[PDB]
Design a protein around this ligand. Sequence first.
Ligand SMILES: C=C1CN=c2nc(N)[nH]c(=O)c2=N1
Ligand SMILES: C=C1CN=c2nc(N)[nH]c(=O)c2=N1
Lengths: 265, 265
Amino acid sequence: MKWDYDLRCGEYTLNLNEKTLIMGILNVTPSDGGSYNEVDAAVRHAKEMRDEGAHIIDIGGESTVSVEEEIKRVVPMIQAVSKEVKLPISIDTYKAEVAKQAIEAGAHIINDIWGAKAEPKIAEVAAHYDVPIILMHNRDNMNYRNLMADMIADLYDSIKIAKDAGVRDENIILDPGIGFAKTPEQNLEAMRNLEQLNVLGYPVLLGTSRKSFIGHVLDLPVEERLEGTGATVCLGIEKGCEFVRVHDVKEMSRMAKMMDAMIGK
Amino acid sequence: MKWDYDLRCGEYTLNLNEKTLIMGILNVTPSDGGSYNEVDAAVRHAKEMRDEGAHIIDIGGESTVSVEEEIKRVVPMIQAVSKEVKLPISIDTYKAEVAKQAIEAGAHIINDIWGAKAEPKIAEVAAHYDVPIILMHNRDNMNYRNLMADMIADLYDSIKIAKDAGVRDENIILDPGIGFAKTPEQNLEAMRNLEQLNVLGYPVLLGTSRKSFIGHVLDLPVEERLEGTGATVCLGIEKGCEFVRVHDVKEMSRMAKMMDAMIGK
Ligand SMILES: C=C1CN=c2nc(N)[nH]c(=O)c2=N1
Ligand SMILES: C=C1CN=c2nc(N)[nH]c(=O)c2=N1
């Protein structure tokens, strides 16, 4: 057992020794906000992902708009899914106010793509509601002295803000932030040296699903990036990742399960 | 450059530093031996595999019969493919006489699933024709003292026979023999410690395509073993394999290509 604690998420509890845990991306196709077609399509997609081996559902407004409206979009979504799919929900925002709404709508984990640097006040919410927060590596420039050395550095400045906010060590997950503020070549390198994040002593989540650096290597558009995704997930798991964040849940679940058998997990 | 030599295969030459090399399994659906439907279906399958990223074609009589007839089956096959698909052909036999026929029919590499222990005389043929021979780990029992320690041992006894036969170090490839004389649990372990084969200083080829230990972990019949295969191939490549032997060439080629970008190859 590398991990002497489970991840506590209100009603559900997630073990870190047993299997690589799969986070299924829930999209958000919007058109005022909350109508039947929107929330219906979201629900059967979450249902489908539960059915195919997913352990968490990640609900994200945006991708790549009004704070007051982001809530009106995403609140109803969480209310429905948590009612209809017994599985923890994480909320993909950086905005403080948004997260508060979501946990109170039903969400269980915060997923912040700016590692509490976008709105420091987020970490406080996470602290106040006692939920597990994911801190992703990001930055508004790409001028690294040393890629990995700087990642770990910036990730620490994230932990500093989390910890000073009241966040317990046991609710902290880290993310190398594949695709964010990194060239196609830099993304390959973070993948190559992913094991280093382990020295920080926190669970690590890896999000490479369908991304464009896969496209740059394989020369293949988004709908043909399943195998390349596979590869990222397998190399990830072998380097000690605890979660992976993917679109193609069925396929990626089976690959995790093989890797798991193989590496001893 | 780990390898200071290329693999010489008559007309074609295979580099070991550039990419993980893909060996595409050619099946052999037989019904007297040599008719139009048989050799036709074999040819377009080899053509298809060339098209999808394969570097070698592996032609095998049997799977899991008369020596005089095995030749009559498999000779015409090699004659056709080498004429119609510019790509080296390996011949999946253990039998001495069979191999001689095949190289003279056109084949370029020997692939012996009994590592020259089945018919020592094979290694001599390989020596006489100067072709690269693959030596797979096998044995007619499964009583290991220490799995990996014994693998390497038995693999050496293979090299001993090869070398005493005249086989140059530069024409020797090794294979852990996944699926052969190993329990589902033992196969997981060989996968886990695949890097050890590297201490012998030879290129390594890995054959796990669609195999049943994948089935035992995932609980899935043969036609649903693509992802599990993926995983074996990726963990393989990361542990330093030079070739992989797969059925699903298109998919496995893209995964190799990702792994290759990622690990630095
Ligand atoms: C494209 C995205 C959006 N949100 C993400 N969130 C996390 N935690 N990790 C990712 O890789 C990620 N990629
Ligand atoms: C099922 C088979 C038949 N021939 C093989 N040959 C080699 N070299 N390696 C394998 O894994 C293999 N598997």
